[PDB]
Amino acid sequence: SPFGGSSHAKGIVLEKLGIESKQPNSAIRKCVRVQLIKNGKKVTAFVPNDGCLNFVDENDEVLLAGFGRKGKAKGDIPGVRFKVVKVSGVSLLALWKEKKEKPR
């Protein structure tokens, strides 16, 4: 529905948006520029936990999903509608809790 009919879309990361944000674990630090493949466009996704931001580097064939805020936060930016849920085959929640291993 937010991209045709699918709930998830594979995508190619352009670059880690905001590496130069000084405040660690901030909204402008936790963004990536994903090239959606299903229609070939740009979008700004919202990877959780900047400590596990640095799994994804460049064309890591990332898999997005919606975000859906359940309230209002302190310094969260609006506009990001997409979060990262799977990167290059594995799920980055499992990567951040270090069960699996990112393959390359």
Partner 1 sequence: AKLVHDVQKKQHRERSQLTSRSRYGFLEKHKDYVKRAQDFHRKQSTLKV
Q: Are 30 and 85 in contact (CB under 8 A)?
A: no
Structure token pair of residue 64 = 């997005």
- For position 49 contacting RNA by CB under 7 A, the verdict is no
Provide the mask over 43-72, with x wherever binding to partner 1 is found by CB under 8 A and - wherever it is not: -----xx-x---------------------
Radius of gyration of the chain, Cα coordinates, nearest whole angstrom: 13
Find the length of the chain: 104
Which residues contact partner 1 by CB under 8 A? 48-49, 51, 96
Which residues contact RNA by CB under 7 A? 22-26, 74-75, 93, 97
